[PDB]
Amino acid sequence: YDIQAWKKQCEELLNLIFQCEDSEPFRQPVDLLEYPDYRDIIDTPMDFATVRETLEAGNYESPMELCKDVRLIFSNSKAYTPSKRSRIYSMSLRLSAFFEEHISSVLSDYKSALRFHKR
């Protein structure tokens, strides 16, 4: 029932993501010189360094907010990909499955901690 535990759990999950080879295209903002039409398709760029910086700055109030930004990294890849069989998009799908499998307990524990507090 530790209401604050999610933060370190997210830091550790981000450390695992940064070690994953599948995160390489998503660690830093998409290089707009390499993909000149990127902002014509993508309204809100997102990447894992931005997520980590937002977390470390104390600018997420909950793991659900972090989860929305991570999910945006994946939806941006799905929206920008010219093919659902592309290399970078295929990396995003694997990384998304890894993230979802690991964030589930973080969200459950946080929500449980809030419920206990309210009780």
Ligand X SMILES: O=C(O)c1cncc(Br)c1
| Minimum CB distance to ligand X, residue 38 (Å) | 6
Instruction: Measure the CA–CA gap between 17 and 34, rounded to whole angstroms.
Output: 23
Q: How far is the CB of 93 from ligand X (least distance, A)?
A: 11
Q: What residues contact 56, with CB distance under 8 A and at least 6 apart?
A: 11
Q: Count of residues binding ligand X (CB under 6 A)?
A: 9
The C-alpha atoms of residue 72 and residue 47 are separated, in whole angstroms, by 8
Binding range to ligand X, per CB under 6 A, among 7-15, 64-72, 73-81, 103-111 = 73-81
Query: How is residue 32 written in tokens?
Result: 């707009």
**Residues 27-46 interacting with ligand X (rule: CB under 6 A):** 30, 35
Should residue 89 be labelled a site residue for ligand X when binding is judged by CB under 6 A? yes
Kindly tell me which of 60 and 89 has the beta carbon lying closer to ligand X.
89
Instruction: Tell me the C-alpha distance between 72 and 111, whole Å.
Output: 22
Q: Which is nearer to ligand X, 21 or 61 (CB)?
A: 21
Query: Can you tell me the distance from the alpha carbon of 1 to that of 110, in angstroms, rounded to the nearest whole number?
Result: 7
Residue ranges in contact with ligand X by CB under 6 A: 30, 35, 77, 80-82, 86, 88-89
